């Protein structure tokens, strides 16, 4: 209850058309349960930082592989999104259309 607002200010970032303007807040409100259970204030650190790690990634996963058509081990989910993040160079440095042939040097790896 004391943290229900911090769940909005983190979650609402990700609700940006992502799947809906709403639902990620309520999944953050369940990530907050694991956070409240493992709240090691006995290290010294603050619940702001706790939320910035754990509750943020509960908010991320709430529509990463949850609510999709498809779901995989998570390294192989967000790696598809590493490529979309890298494409921000491609679309302006090769800079007319995207080319997997450029992505091969930007990943140092074979396409297949």
């Amino acid at each position: 209850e004391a943290n229900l607002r911090l769940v909005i200010s983190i979650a609402k970032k990700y609700t940006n058309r992502g799947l809906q303007f709403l639902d990620l807040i309520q999944e953050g409100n369940i990530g907050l349960m694991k956070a409240v259970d493992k709240f090691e204030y006995r290290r010294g650190y603050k619940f702001s930082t706790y939320a910035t790690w754990w509750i943020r990634q509960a908010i991320t996963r709430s529509i990463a592989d949850q609510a999709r058509t498809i779901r995989i081990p998570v390294h192989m989910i967000e790696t598809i999104n590493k490529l979309n993040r890298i494409s921000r160079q491609m679309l302006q440095e090769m800079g007319r259309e995207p080319t997997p042939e450029e992505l091969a040097e930007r990943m140092l790896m074979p396409e297949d």
Partner: protein
Amino acid sequence: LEAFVQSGNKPEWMILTVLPVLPPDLRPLVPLDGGRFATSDLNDLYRRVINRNNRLKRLLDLAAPDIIVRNEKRMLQEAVDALLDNGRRGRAITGSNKRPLKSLA
């Protein structure tokens, strides 16, 4: 009430506790050759309902703050009634090409 007596109806059926689910072949779930899937509308509306209801369950299963339960009840009814007749509940459920999703109605 006279029509209920003469036909076999019961008033509990106004306020249900179970959503029946549209058989997949009426919303025909299959893959496509282009590595894409038949994920359309009468499938995705049930994803949103399943997710909201699976939160409402977990919140009761853990006995959470009743705020989060009250909001998820309201969000569940919103998603059930939009799955039934999308738009009519003064709002519609949509996807990235702006459009509403096709309802059961």
